[PDB]
Each structure stands twice: as structure tokens, then as C-alpha cells.
Amino acid sequence: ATLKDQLIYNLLKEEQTPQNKITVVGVGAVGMACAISILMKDLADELALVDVIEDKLKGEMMDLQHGSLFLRTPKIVSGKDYNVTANSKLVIITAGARQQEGESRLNLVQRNVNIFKFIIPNVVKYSPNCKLLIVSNPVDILTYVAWKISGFPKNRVIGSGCNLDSARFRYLMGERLGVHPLSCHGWVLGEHGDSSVPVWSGMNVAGVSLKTLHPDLGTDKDKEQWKEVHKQVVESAYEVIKLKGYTSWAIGLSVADLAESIMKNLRRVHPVSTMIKGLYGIKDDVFLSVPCILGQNGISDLVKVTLTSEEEARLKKSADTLWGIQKELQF
Amino acid sequence: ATLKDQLIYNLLKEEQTPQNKITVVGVGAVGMACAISILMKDLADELALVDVIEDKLKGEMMDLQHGSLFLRTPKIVSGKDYNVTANSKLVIITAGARQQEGESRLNLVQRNVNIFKFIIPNVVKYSPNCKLLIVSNPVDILTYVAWKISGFPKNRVIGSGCNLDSARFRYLMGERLGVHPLSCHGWVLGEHGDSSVPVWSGMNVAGVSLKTLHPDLGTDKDKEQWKEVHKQVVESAYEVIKLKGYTSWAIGLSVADLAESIMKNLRRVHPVSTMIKGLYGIKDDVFLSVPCILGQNGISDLVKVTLTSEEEARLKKSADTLWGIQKELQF
Amino acid sequence: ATLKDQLIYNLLKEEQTPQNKITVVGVGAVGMACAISILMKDLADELALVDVIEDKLKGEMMDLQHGSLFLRTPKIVSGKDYNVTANSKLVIITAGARQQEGESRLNLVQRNVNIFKFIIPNVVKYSPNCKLLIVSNPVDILTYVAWKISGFPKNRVIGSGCNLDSARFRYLMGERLGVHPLSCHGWVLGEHGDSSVPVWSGMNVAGVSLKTLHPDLGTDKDKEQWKEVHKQVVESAYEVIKLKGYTSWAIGLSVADLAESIMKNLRRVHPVSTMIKGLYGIKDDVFLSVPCILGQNGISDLVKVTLTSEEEARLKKSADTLWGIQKELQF
Amino acid sequence: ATLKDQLIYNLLKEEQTPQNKITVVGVGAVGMACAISILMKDLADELALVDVIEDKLKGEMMDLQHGSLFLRTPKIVSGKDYNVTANSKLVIITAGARQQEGESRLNLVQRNVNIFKFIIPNVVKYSPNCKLLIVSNPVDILTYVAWKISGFPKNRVIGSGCNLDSARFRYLMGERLGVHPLSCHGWVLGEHGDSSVPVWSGMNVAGVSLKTLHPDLGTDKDKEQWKEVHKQVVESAYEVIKLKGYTSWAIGLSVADLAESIMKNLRRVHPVSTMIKGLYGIKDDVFLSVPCILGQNGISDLVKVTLTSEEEARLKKSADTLWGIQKELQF
Could you name the active-site residues (chains A, B, C, D)? Predict the structure, then answer.
């Protein structure tokens, strides 16, 4: 018969079903940075890409496939049809609009809510037991939207949130102190956006509180202008957008970071978007970033961070901003 | 005193001189795919990016920097000035014009030769002992150009060549046979382009010659049309370009593959562009892809592949095509 | 009330099915080398160790646990009771007697068959859908034993076989040729032991047949004495045993190599102990090493290597030796 | 012509000089756990092993070499002669006596000081610009000894110190809290031994001070008995020794962790043995563990941790114990 038959004696065949499948919805720069990052961290036995643009989708899939020799993910598939998404453990949504230069993420809300009305039911149809990781902006509101639409328990709907903001924060912290970001600790919580809250009280190296060493830290009076580090965090996205048109690599790595914790059930702590109703006097169904324990069931636990009254005030302000938009939605 | 000084007592100033520095010239899609791939394989203690477009360059650098928390490359720098490139072990050139839909890589020659006249002397100025890895197209001619311009010994000028073509070939081989590409062996040699030569005689799984099993393999008579696999290899770049506008991920991974062998002195065998004068009756200073041993001195050795008379004829044809263009290059 | 409760909320409690669990039976040098190798390749979300020596077992578990900060396997458990083994994807058997200086692996047969009569039913009880990877010696016979005892289909019973022999072979090949073993190809098949068969016909670098270049390769007349490379393969175990008392690291890495292909469903080709009946005129239920495709269902396929009449004669001889012992087996 | 010449055409001859060489002195369980850990983290282009026991040494080398197929370290060498050590970037000393069950590490001092009088000058002879990483016990005193003997600047003499103690601490912290150790923060400083100091003030998850949440933390009055976590840290080594005869895996991983920071110039913070004269009112040349910034020049910086008066008292006590022994040392 065939060359294959001359060479290989077959015992089995289909031997099917993926055990560790990840789907990325959206093959824009963000989606593909998530894809490459996940492929190179060996988090998946199958990667599925979905988009509406069929030419781009096939091209992206093929480009990844041509590099298969150098990867350890044996199955890469794509399709407009969500059936390619079946039995995903983790589905990452990166599809939607995306802010231009000067544009608030909050300005994307109605466009991307409409998109989610199509995407989320289709994802859920084919992977009912998946975790949903929302990356599309505004991520905090859209996490809430994905939660309402999907009907999933809240532990299985995670927004990428301030994982990236905190990463940026720690990078800049490290630059100032001459320490690798890995050894620089500090949390940016709340909205992934303009109303993010830097937790000065928590900033530390080797367990040494920076606010203790330097009480002016985070105030306007601060001779060292540490408040500017947070300002740079807020402005990062806009500045990168200004310079190169979009952001991709940082968010990609950030998402693979979250994927790693979920897929490997690490129970690491990440600042990600989740429902915070009942904390810090928030009474509504607001989603924003707090430190959460991430594992194979998604968010199993929240860390109840202690905030200064001002830090708490800023977080309540973030909550209000978000709830203001959320309440007007048809989810 | 500053917070840094309050917190940290310094013994030593200046983390002086990079030990494992890689430079990527060109921050187009290819350059940045090389960058991310190298960053995630931990091949460098310092990554430098260089381009002429200053806004894009700074934006790319910053995007990578924001993800520092998730990498183990502590220093990422960029600049128009080649002084950011100093003391590189490996310099990867991805700058230049790239082919549009329908356009032969050979059509880029004069534009990219002009570019290389600027780039190569600047690279050499700041990293005289580096290895040059040429990725810009047409890679085989431009490797020769980089060799002439740099004045480097031929072992330190390497073209990415058919590393990717072979990777694609093995992917497709694997698809047909139901085997991981890692276990599918087969070489595409010669021009990284239309005149590439698939070495049917060398195609094997588990040491079993496929041509032995199936003598029609590679010919027009072949009922199974294995020739079409090489068909797909030649046309890959064009089809991906057609679908998504460019290729990035596969070439990126391919380049990191080569970088890994160089940086870690693996002495693995890769089909890369090098001078083949004196082999297969080629008498001119032609560069094309043959299997080479890659390590910390670049190409230390060539494998002298045995070719069928036809396979050799195809390689001589590839050589002629390339030499035809090479001879005209007064640059 | 507790600090844990003050700090950490809880959305989701009971949970607890492992998705990617590996069990290692036997915490001798081999077992623990398998354990460390698997832990550092991130192949498992849970590692279980089982042995009969309770003090040693607990000590080993604890030592690994103390290094948890530096691993990505969140759950390490041990116990005499096989209930710690439940829901393993892959169970690696390394328990039993091992050969002393001068002792043939075939001399371990009755002792280890008796051991397997206890081990295998217990493994199967708690992980009925696992793949069994047999490492205990003589691995080829004991793979057959594990197959008979377990009642598993033959695809889910894999002996580590000649994966290590081939690895050694390629190392030595590489030493002689000045090439990384990764780029040196050559298969040692049959018994993991004295009657192993080096497939000279398949030995190649970059697809170039070494036997073609050097027809004396593998014969006694060979001026270069390539036969000695195989002799060194056969004698490796004995020489290492002579020098340090046992072998551990190489077999450990070899086993993690196989585990990687199984867990990640790579469909890579490895020379491992399996069913062979119906190939090369073998008519009995002999298990020995041939190149097999390894994935999430274990051995899905065998590669039908072409052998010289002598290579085939040697493999039939290996088969006879093994069958001679197998037929006499006392369960 | 030889087979080598038929197969390989040579461009380049001598090749050589290691760029990223690591030496491990001592091939006891600790030495070899360091070796395997380093080999699997790809930290070295060359690994050298040295010991006095020639049979064991050769056996260990060979066992690692046989697994070369599965590693990316192309050169593994061993020898009694320290010339195999030449041009190491990092030399890890694990040779010497180790403690028995119930035996204080401080009881090893004179035996291992004598050993160091031979080892250290030989290491320095062949790798004058290396970093010395001392693992032999008592590590704090022996770091001081290696510093005095070598004549190196203090930044290039590093004791593994409390990197492991802190790792154990964080593991146990994580066990109690249901969080991965990576997300559990807490430092054990001072002597790697009975007089280690747990920094209760610094213990945190997600930046939330545990002592703030639970003021009894670390006291005897503590209902939750967190003091027992530290007691378990002190007793770990002894309990593992009691159970399996020695410790290997945890210290191995801990050492590779430090090696990673040094080789890749990460500037991560690790609690390692260094000279602390001038801190916490210590006036003598005492070495003990404080958080240090680790990179390619070794210890570039110390973090000046803020301690409670009691925590500081405990550290001064640790310092006194160590200085008591150090002052008596003769050369």
C-alpha cells in the first residue's frame, strides 16, 4: 500500500480528545502574542485559534505550524467555527476593538459587549467546563459581561486585570532600585486603566516595607516622586500605542503567566479581575483586580489586602467608575 | 539619601560588560519574533534592538521591558546608534525590504545590499568578534554580502538559509505520516527560495529510508505525490504573505533555534547559508544552504551530503541562479 | 478566626482530581532520578512516590517537598499504601532487585516477577486507565509480565527498553564524529542487555548513511572498530555499576524523555519494549525494543525498521533468549 | 581517508575555551544533586566535576555523559587534577564531611577547614576570576574561610547560606495557607543551622503582613503555633538525615537557583552567606545570611532588612556563635 503503511504498523487511530487544550479567540497582535507565549511555555497539548477574519486566521495558524519542529505543542488548529474550540481547559478572549492613541479602554465598552454576545455563548457551547480568561478591554467590565453571558460560576471567569500593571510597576520599581523585578514587590489593584490603585503600603524588597523606610512614598510631597512610577504604569499602554500602534508582548507574557498558574494548578497569587462585591464596602456586582489564588478551578480564593483609608478610597472610586458603566449595560 | 541607598549597601559598581549579548537589527515582524523567541529561550543576558525608525524602536523595547517580570534576560536596550550593540556574541540582521505578495526574494537584492553597506560596518565596529546571522532576504546572497563587507572569516557569517524550509518540510512530512516532526528527517538545501532542493535520498523515519520503501518518492510518477510536499515548502512564504501580509513566527523560532546552537556551542547540524565553493563542482563564491555544524565559532564544519545526480543537478542550478545575481553586485 | 482565614477568602473548596498525575514506584536511586527529572521538566501536576521502606520513602518525599519553591509541581505525596497513586496518567515501576557487578539483568527475573505480582494489581486498582512504564529489569520480560498481570491493552504497557541504549550509542557516536548526539542517529534494538542489536544500516548524520560511506561499519574487519561502540553500550551499565555501584542519572533522564512524549502526546519515536509478535518472523509473545510512536495512549504504532539479514538474525536471537525465559514463567 | 574525513569537511580547528563553565567540587549526594540540577537548567556550556575518590568520580561523570542526548551541556569532564576546572565562571564547593544524625554542622568545622586549605588554592589557581559558591558546612564559617584562603574580594565568595532554609520556610508557610511557596514570602536569616532567625515581621502573602493580621505570630503564646514552622526548618536537615541518611535534592535545587542568578546576571535577591560587618552592630568579620543581590559579579549589594529588636537580638546571637568559632581558626 501507501508509504505510511509500508513504514508504520498501526495499532489504533483517533485515540482522541485533548487533555490540556487552550483556545485563543482573536488573532490580533495581542492574541498572537498570547499564542506564541503559550506555545513556548509548553502549557498546551492543543492550541486552537478562532477569529472572524478567515485569511488572517489561516495565515497565523500556518505560521505557527511551520515552527512545529521547535515547539512541544503537537496540535495547532484554527477556524471561524467554534467547533475547533471543543474541550478547551482554558479559553482566552482577546477579540474586540482596542484603544487608539488617546482613547480610554472604557470607550470600547458597547462595541466589545456586542462582540461578547456572539463569542461567549459559542465558547461555552463547545467547552462548558473551561476557565474563561478575558483580555479584551475594558477587561474589568468585560469580565463581568462574560460572567453574566456564560452563566459560569465566578471562579471560572477571570480578567487579565492588573497582572500586567503590577508587572510594569515591578519593572519600574526594579529600574529605580537596581533589583530584578522578581525581587521587587508591589501591587496595582482596581481598574486596569486610569483609576488603578498602587498599594504603597505593600511595596517591599526582601520583606522590608519601603513605606516604612520612606514615609513620603506615594505622596505628592515625596522628594523622590515615587507617585510617578504609578503614573508611568497608567500611561504605559498609551505611550506604547503612541510609539508602535499597539501593545502585544507584555500582555502576551502576562496572559501566559496566568495560563501557567491555571493549567499547572500552581495556586499562585495574581492581581486579576474578579467579583469584589462585599469587600471594601462595595455593594454592587463590580469586577476589578484584587490578588487572587489561581489554579485549575480558576480563582479559588481572594487575598483580602489591607489598604490605607486613602488606598481604599481610591479602590472604591475605581469601583464606582466601573459600576457606573456596568449598570447601563445590556449584558 | 535615596530609598535605594537607605535599603541597599553597595559593594560593587557597574555590572560591567555583557557575557552573552545578542543584538537584533530590524524591529519589523521578523526581528521582533526573533527577539521574543530568544527572550523566552533565555539565550541572552542582554538583548539590544536597533532600527532606523525611532518611534517604533522605542515602543518595541518598552513593550518587551514591561514583561521583564516574566523573562530571565535582565537588560533590554535599543537605539538608532550602534553603540547599544557593543560586545554582542551574536548579531542577527533582519533589517531591509521584504517581499510582497508574488515578489521573489531575489527582487530585494539591490535595496538590501545598499542597506547592508550601512549596517554591516557599524555592527562590526562595535562587536568585531561576533557571529553574524543574516535573516534578511535574499538570505543566501546577503550572507555573501555580509561576508564581503564585514571582512569576517566565513565561519562567523551564517545565513538563516533553509533551516526554516527544512522545518516546514518536516512538519508536512509529519502530518502525512502521523509522526512528530522531531522524528521525521529530511533536508531542503540550496536557495532559501524557489530553487530549493529536497533531498529525497535522505528522507527517513527511525533510520528507514523512505526512497527505499517508495522509489517513486519525489518524482512525477509518484502516485502519492510527495513532490507536492516540497511544493508546499517553496510556496509557504507566499501563501502566508497572501493570507496575513508577512511571515514572522516560524522564521523567529527558526532563528532562535540557530541562536541556541551558537550561544550554547551545541555543535548541532543545521541547513544554513555558507560558502560552498569546492563542493558539488561549484567553483564560485556562492553561498547556499548545506548541513553545517553550528557552535560558538559559528560554522565549524560542513556535512558533505551525498546527492543523487538529479539532486546535485538541482543544487548546481540553485548555485547558478544565485551566482548570476552575485556576480553583478558591485556595491 | 485563624490567620489563614483572615488572609485568604475561599470561593471553591473540595475539588481535587489530578489532571496530570505521575506515580513512581520504587524510591531507589533509579526511582528518585526519574522523580527529579520529571519534576524539573514540569510533566506532572502531582507526583506520588510509593515504596515498602517507609523511612526512606518519607525522607525522599520531604527532600523533594522542601524544594517546591523551585519547581512547578504543586503536590508531592508518598505512602506505602497505593491509594496515594489514584488517578495517575502514568505509573513508572522502578521497584525490584537490580543487578550487581557482573550480574545479568536476566538473573533478576524470578525475584522481580514475584514483586510485580504485588505491585501491578495495586497500581491497576487505583489508576485503571494509566499507562504503565516499566523500568525494572529485565525490562523486556517484566514489560510482558506487567502486561499479563495488569490485563491492560498492549499499548498501555511500555518498557523503558533500549531508549537508554540508543542514547548511549548516540553519545559515543557523537564523541567519535565531533557532533552533538542530537544530530547523530542510530538505533539499538532488541533486549535491553547483552543481546542488543545495533542497526548499522540506519546510522547516519544529516541523512548521510554511515554504512554507505564505510561498508565495513559494524563488522570485525572494520579498521575503525565501530563494533566497539556497541560493545561499550552493552558494557556501560556494568562499568558504571563497577565504578559507582549503580546507574541512576542516565536512566532517569531517559525515563523522563519517555514520560514527556506520553504526557504531552508528542508522537515521537522511541525504542521501547513492546509487542513484536508477527514482525521479523517472531511468532511468540516476546516483548523487546523496536521504534514506537509514543503519545497519550502509550504506543500507538511501531516503525517497521528494515534490517540486514544479519541484523534481523541478531534480533531473532534476542527474541529467542527472551522467549526462553518468558515461557518458563511462574505466575 | 578516514570516515570522519569522508563525512565532515573542516573549516575550523581548535574551537575551545569554555564561555560558561561551572565546576562542582565533591561528587557526594549534594554535589551530584547540584550537578543534575544545573545540567537540567542549561546554566553551563561545560561542567567539570572534581573529587579525590577516582572511581566514584569517573562513574558519576560517565552516568551524566550517557544522558547527554537529553541535555544541552555539551562538555562534561571530571578529574582528581584541578586543571579540569580551568576557566570556570562559577565553582561550587560541596566537598567535606557532612553531619550525622544529631550532629551540629558547627562540629564539621576543623575537618572541613583542613579540606578547604587544599581545595580553595587549587580552584583559584585554575579559575582566578570565578565566583566561589560554598555549600560545605558549616557554610557560614566556611564561606569566611574560602574568603580568607582565596584572597578574593568578598563579592566573589558566596555561601549557599539560608537560601534553602527560606525555601523550606516558604514551603511550610504555603502548606498552612494553601498557597504555592512562590506566593508565600518570609526570610530565614543568620546561621544556616540551629541559630537561624525567622523574620516574622517580613512574612506576607500578596504584600499583606501576617504579623499585622496575627500579632501572636512567632511567639510562644501563638494559638496557631507559627513558631513551629521555624522549628521545622531547623529540624528539617536532621529529620531527612534520620529518614534517608542525607539531604540532596533540596540543597541541589537551592544551589542551582543561586547558580542561575549568578550565570544569567539576574540581580535577584537571595539569603546567602556574606560578610555582614557593620550591620546590626556586628563589628567582626562574621559571615552569615542576609538578603543579597546576586549577579555575574556575585554579591553586588545587601538588603538592609529591618528587624524587630528581638529578631535583631537573635541575629546578633547567631553572629556571636559564629564569631566564637571563627576567631579560633588558624590557617
Answer: 192
Element (H, E) at A159: strand A157-159
Cβ D244–C4 below 8 Å, yes or no? no
Please pick, among B66, B180, B185, B192, the residue that the annotation labels catalytic.
B192
CA B124 to chain centre: 18
Among chain B residues, CA nearest to C290: B206
Same domain, A278 and A154: no
Q: Which residues of B touch C187 (CB under 8 A)?
A: 206-207
- Tell me whether strands D157-159 and D197-198 are parallel, antiparallel or unpaired: unpaired
Positions of C annotated as catalytic residues are: 192
Pair B36, B52: CB distance under 8 Å: no
Largest CA distance in chain C: 82
Length of chain A: 331
Cα gap B167→B151, rounded to integer Å: 31
- Contact of B74 with A178, CB cutoff 8 Å: no
Search chain C and give the residue with CA nearest D254: C67
Residue showing cell 505628592 = A220
Total domain count, chain C: 2
Q: Which residue is associated with the grid cell 473551561?
A: A130
Greatest distance between any 2 Cα atoms in chain A: 82
Chain center to CA of C214: 32
Q: D176 CB contacts (<8 Å, ≥6 apart)? A: C4, D229
Q: Which three cell numbers stand for residue A151?
A: 452563566
Query: In b/e form, how buried is each residue of A205-232, taking b as 16+ CB within 10 angstroms?
Result: bbbbbbbebbebbbeeebeeebbebbee
Of B130, B32, B148, the C-alpha closest to B86 is B130
Question: Is there a single domain that holds both residue B166 and residue B303?
Answer: yes
Q: With CA atoms as reference, report the closest residue to A100 among A244, A213, A241, A230.
A: A241
> In C, what residues contact B, Cβ < 8 A?
178-180, 182-183, 185-187, 199, 201-209, 212-213, 266-269, 291, 293, 301, 303-306
Q: Are residues D152 and D138 in the same domain?
A: yes
Method of elucidation: X-ray
How many angstroms away from the CA of B258 is the closest CA of chain D?
14
Reported as type and span, the H/E element at residue A298 is strand A298-302
**Residue A60: all three cell numbers together:** 497565523
Q: Are residues A55 and A175 in the same domain?
A: no
Say if residue D197 is in the same domain as residue D303. yes
CA gyration radius for chain B? Answer: 21
Task: Return phi, psi of residue A10, to 5°.
Answer: -95, 130
Q: Mark yes or no for CB contact A301/C264 under 8 Å.
A: no
Q: Give the closest of A9, A260, A304 to C304, CB-based.
A: A9
Length of chain B: 331
CB nearest D207 (choices: A183, A204, A301): A204
Put simply, the answer to whether D244 touches C65 (Cβ < 8 Å) is: no
Strands of D131-134's sheet, edge to edge?
B8-10, D298-303, D287-295, D268-275, D157-159, D131-134, D88-93, D21-25, D46-50, D75-78
Taking each helix axis from N to C terminus, what angle separates B249-263 and B29-40, rounded to the nearest 10 degrees? 50
Mutation for testing the C interface, residue in A5, A6, A15 having most C CBs under 10 Å: A15
- Residue C301's domain comprises 162-329
3-state secondary structure of B278: coil
Is the distance from CB of B127 to CB of B87 less than 8 angstroms? yes
**Cα gap A60→B252, rounded to integer Å:** 13
Active-site annotation of A, residues: 192
